[PDB]
């Protein structure tokens, strides 16, 4: 059976009438790059778990997508991030919710699964758990983009 990957960068009102092809191509190129990375990893024999973790990490790093860098803003102009990973082989899972000082929530989620007996950690406790295990503390403004901020200002 063939190995395969799928990714998404969010569903919603995406209006073609308000877009140009070159604008669309920036998303297409971003998606293609990430899916291709995943494909190569699969072809090379990497695990499904490692492939999904890396694909999501890359989607977090991209500012085009609402996760990690490029996250939307709360009502208070803050960022609160959530993530989950699940291994279909063991049925183990790891998740973090409400984190603001971790660059890559999906990596924190994976850390919960692999280095604790738990499935879900939230907020400060999730952050402290990760910091105690070598994950770096960041300031939440690293996730902020003018695009998402204008969307908050407009949503008001």
């Amino acid at each position: 059976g063939k190995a395969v990957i799928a990714i998404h960068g969010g569903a919603g009102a995406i209006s073609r009438a308000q877009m140009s092809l070159q604008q669309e191509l920036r998303y297409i190129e971003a998606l293609s790059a990430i899916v291709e990375t995943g494909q190569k990893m699969l072809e090379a024999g990497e695990s499904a778990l490692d492939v999904v973790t890396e694909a999501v990490r890359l989607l977090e790093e991209c500012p085009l997508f609402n996760a990690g860098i490029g996250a939307v803003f709360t009502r208070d102009e803050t960022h609160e991030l959530d993530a989950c990973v699940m291994d279909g082989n063991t049925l183990k899972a790891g998740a973090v919710a409400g984190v603001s000082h971790l660059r890559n929530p999906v990596l924190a989620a994976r850390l919960v699964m692999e280095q604790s007996p738990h499935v879900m950690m939230i907020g400060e406790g999730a952050e402290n758990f990760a910091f105690a295990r070598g994950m770096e503390r960041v300031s939440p403004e690293i996730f902020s983009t003018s695009l998402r901020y204008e969307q908050l200002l407009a949503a008001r």
Partner: protein
Amino acid sequence: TVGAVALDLDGNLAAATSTGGMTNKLPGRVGDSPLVGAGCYANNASVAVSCTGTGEVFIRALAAYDIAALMDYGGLSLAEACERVVMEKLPALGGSGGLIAIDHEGNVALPFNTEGMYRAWGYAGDTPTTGIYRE
């Protein structure tokens, strides 16, 4: 919200989901993304799923696990299970969004009931397909 699902060369399935949530959410709000069976689920016996949309409905409907259960208990194909959940059940509850899913045999589905969903997929050793708008 972003996500990924995969089937590897050993036949293992996995899923991951990550998000910043919804613009202007109340601080402390948790959507479907970090909830097993809501926004993320994987089981070698059935399917790997990552969701995106109006989180609240995906929680109430346990969207990701529902795909799995429809296939496992209901005997539905991946396509049928996706149609039922995304095009019928979620809208009935006022939910908007979509998901990506791969079953244990390598079938892939990227259903959504919104105007668009940034997405891509590809078999190992083949050229990928991308998409934004409705097929």
